[PDB]
PDB file of C-alpha atoms in Angstrom:
ATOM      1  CA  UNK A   1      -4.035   7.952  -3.969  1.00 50.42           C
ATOM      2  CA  UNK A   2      -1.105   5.313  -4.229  1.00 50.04           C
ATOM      3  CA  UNK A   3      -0.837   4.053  -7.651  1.00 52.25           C
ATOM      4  CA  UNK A   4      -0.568   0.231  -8.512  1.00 49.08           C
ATOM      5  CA  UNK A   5       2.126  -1.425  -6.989  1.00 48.38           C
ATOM      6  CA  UNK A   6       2.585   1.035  -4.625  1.00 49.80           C
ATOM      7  CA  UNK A   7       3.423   1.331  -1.330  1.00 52.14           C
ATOM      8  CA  UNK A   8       0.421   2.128   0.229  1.00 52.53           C
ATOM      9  CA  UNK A   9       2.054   1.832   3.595  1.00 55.80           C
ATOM     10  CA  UNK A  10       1.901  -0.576   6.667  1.00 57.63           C
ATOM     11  CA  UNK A  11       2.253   0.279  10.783  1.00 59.31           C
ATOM     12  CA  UNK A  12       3.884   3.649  10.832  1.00 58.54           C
ATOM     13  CA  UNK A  13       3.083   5.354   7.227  1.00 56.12           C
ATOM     14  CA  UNK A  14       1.324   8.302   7.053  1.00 57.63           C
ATOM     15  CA  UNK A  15       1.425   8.858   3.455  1.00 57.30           C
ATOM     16  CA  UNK A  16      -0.852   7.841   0.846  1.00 56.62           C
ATOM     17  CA  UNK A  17      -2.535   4.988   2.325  1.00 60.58           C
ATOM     18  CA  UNK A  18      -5.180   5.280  -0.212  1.00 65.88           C
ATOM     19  CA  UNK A  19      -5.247   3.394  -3.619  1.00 65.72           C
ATOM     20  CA  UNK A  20      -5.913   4.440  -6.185  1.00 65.15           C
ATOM     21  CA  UNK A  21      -9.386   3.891  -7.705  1.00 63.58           C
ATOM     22  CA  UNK A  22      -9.257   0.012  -9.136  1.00 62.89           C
ATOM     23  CA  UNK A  23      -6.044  -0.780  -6.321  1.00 65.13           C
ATOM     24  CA  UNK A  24      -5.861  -2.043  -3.185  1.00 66.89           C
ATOM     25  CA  UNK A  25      -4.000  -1.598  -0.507  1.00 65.40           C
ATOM     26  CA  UNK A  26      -2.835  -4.988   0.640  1.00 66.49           C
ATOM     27  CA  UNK A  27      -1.079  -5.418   4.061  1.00 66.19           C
ATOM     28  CA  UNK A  28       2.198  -7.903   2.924  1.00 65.44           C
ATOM     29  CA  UNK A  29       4.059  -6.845   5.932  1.00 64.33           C
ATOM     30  CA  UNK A  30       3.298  -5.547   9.081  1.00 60.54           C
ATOM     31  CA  UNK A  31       5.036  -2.286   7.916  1.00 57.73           C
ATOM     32  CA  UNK A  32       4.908  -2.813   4.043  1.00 57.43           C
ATOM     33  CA  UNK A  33       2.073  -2.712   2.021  1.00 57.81           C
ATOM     34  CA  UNK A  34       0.948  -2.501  -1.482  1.00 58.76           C
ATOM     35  CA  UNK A  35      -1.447  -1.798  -3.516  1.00 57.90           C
ATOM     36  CA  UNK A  36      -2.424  -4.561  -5.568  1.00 57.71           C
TER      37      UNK A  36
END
């Protein structure tokens, strides 16, 4: 799971989209997000 402050990923990751427990994975940009 993506830690805090992580890039959880927008449009086109296919990494960890998941947060971690406690974090979410907040769309900022249409490619970049992060886990807040």
């Amino acid at each position: 799971t993506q830690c805090h402050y992580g890039q959880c990923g927008g449009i086109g990751y296919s990494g960890p989209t998941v947060c971690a427990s406690g974090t979410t994975c907040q769309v900022l940009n249409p490619y970049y997000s992060q886990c807040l």
